[PDB]
Amino acid sequence: SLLPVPYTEAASLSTGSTVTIKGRPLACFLNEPYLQVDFHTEMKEESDIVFHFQVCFGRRVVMNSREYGAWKAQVESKNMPFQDGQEFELSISVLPDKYQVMVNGQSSYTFDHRIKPEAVKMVQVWRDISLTKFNVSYLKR
Amino acid sequence: SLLPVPYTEAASLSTGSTVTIKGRPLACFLNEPYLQVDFHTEMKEESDIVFHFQVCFGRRVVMNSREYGAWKAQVESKNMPFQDGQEFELSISVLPDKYQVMVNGQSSYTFDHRIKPEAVKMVQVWRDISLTKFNVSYLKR
């Protein structure tokens, strides 16, 4: 749809920042489309990832970090608030101790900070979705 | 690039048919982009899949069929002829007993027929690639 996918935006994050994403899977859940959101330390796609969020729609979510080129301890969730065939609204809030992921207004995942959110320089949203909205808030000191 | 992804084309297959695909991953291999090619029994995306071919670039390939809505026995390969950052040419030939997958001219995977190739009505190419060429040959009786 509207925004290009893969979608890359330079970004800064700190406590109080919110990343808002509205989009839709490109396939029915039987075909297992993916969604991935990565908070990177540089604009380069091969850079480290402070927060990796990967949905296999209808199946599972994995979260991780990639530090000095290497994936760390994977967190796997079977929580699946996403609905087959539907648009979703994803909010990722930067709290003092963790990221909180809201899906369609419902708290759905959290991930404790392994690297300070101030290390983030770029956000990438990609895999099997269309994207109609992407925002990073910048209202707090 | 040129062709829309996900890419869907109505198709018929029999012994001697070749499916030719030229494209490029949308991400470096460190980020594990995927490629998927599915030979479907109907135009509907939720229809059965006579041949499912899914590459996790740099990691593995899985092949399967989806019959009456259910995935069957997975075949997993660690053969990885695809090159990081490069365009690829994929050929899938319909032989009497199997599909043969050539990558950049090199025989790389085969998959014995579980359902007659004449059941195919549609081919879908999707996930994290751009596509510049897609062809199904129709020269044989």
From Swiss-Prot, chains A, B:
One of its GO terms (biological process) is regulation of T cell anergy. One of its GO terms (cellular component) is collagen-containing extracellular matrix. Gene3D superfamilies: 2.60.120.200. The record marks N135 as: Not glycosylated. The keyword 4Fe-4S does not apply. GO terms for molecular function: carbohydrate binding; identical protein binding. The modification N-acetylserine is found at S1. PROSITE patterns: GALECTIN. Residues 5-137 form the Galectin domain. Expressed abundantly in the bone marrow. Expressed exclusively by eosinophils and basophils. Not detected in monocytes and neutrophils. Expressed in CD25-positive regulatory T-cells (Treg) (at protein level). Found in intestinal tissue from patients with Celiac disease, expression is directly related to the histological grade of mucosal damage and to the number of eosinophils found in the duodenal lesion (at protein level). Found in sputum of patients with eosinophilic inflammatory diseases such as asthma (at protein level). CDD domains: GLECT. The keyword Cell inner membrane does not apply. Keywords: Acetylation, Cytoplasm, Lectin. It is found in: Cytoplasm, Cytosol; Cytoplasmic granule. Regulates immune responses through the recognition of cell-surface glycans. Essential for the anergy and suppressive function of CD25-positive regulatory T-cells (Treg). Forms hexagonal bipyramidal crystals, known as Charcot-Leyden crystals, in tissues and secretions from sites of eosinophil-associated inflammation and some myeloid leukemias. Interacts with CEL. This is Galectin-10. It comes from Homo sapiens.
